[PDB]
Homo-oligomer: A and B are copies of this chain.
């Protein structure tokens, strides 16, 4: 835990790479910026790309939910981003270029969802600083944001290929982590994690609860979430588990918001 004077001494004298400074910074107090808020991701390919039949029931749950919860609602990108990635990858463009293309598609989805929620007072928020979040959360209990991280040309590439490895799962998760939110819910189109892709395996086994290390052991590291999210989850200071739920089933989002286990819970440990 060390001291203020020793952290100060270390910060002024050593490289930020110094393990002694790193350990002292690790002892600093931990403030949660929005501890009463919940981050939810509304799937791009899994939900918004499906149109009215998927989106309209979830709009209703969001409108009902914000009477009891404070919601930061991030959007995935989905099939238009997959198309941009295909074109750009075929041209030899790097992950840092592809990242900006995926961002624009998540922006589109946030604008569409936001326009369905505007008459309830719920805004779409953006900009580097997300300056409109605090007033909006206090006043109408919900905001919509685009789920891509802002890394753009500084996107870290994967070990293989040019597809950006940090996409809208990571973008939503990191905001929940940064703001110290009380939970992170991913809304998709399946009940949760299965032993294999339930769309393409008829006898896949549903998994209600799993650790990151067990997901990796089972080869499920890049199944239901972007694989870096599992490592971000193990590094996280505030959000040490997430829940993935089926947004096509009425009430799943509502119940998960209330803390009920209705899909797959993934835990850091």
Q: Closest residue of chain B to A117, judged by CB?
A: B134
> A124 — which chain B residues lie within 8 A by C-beta?
129, 131, 134
Q: Which of A32-40, A157-165, A169-177 contacts B (4 or more CB under 8 A)?
A: A32-40
Given A33-B115, A115-B33: A132 in contact with B131 (beta carbons within 8 A) = yes
Given A135-B135, A140-B138: A119 in contact with B33 (beta carbons within 8 A) = yes
A131 touches B139 (CB 8 A): no
Let me know if A29 is at the binding interface, CB within 8 A. Answer: yes
A11 to chain B, nearest CB (A): 12
A117 to chain B, nearest CB (A): 7
Let me know if A237 is at the binding interface, CB within 8 A. Answer: no
> A4 — which chain B residues lie within 8 A by C-beta?
51
Let me know if A31 is at the binding interface, CB within 8 A. Answer: yes
Let me know if A126 is at the binding interface, CB within 8 A. Answer: yes
Cβ proximity bits A5-47 to B, threshold 8 Å, 1 near / 0 not: 0000000000000000000000001011111100000000000
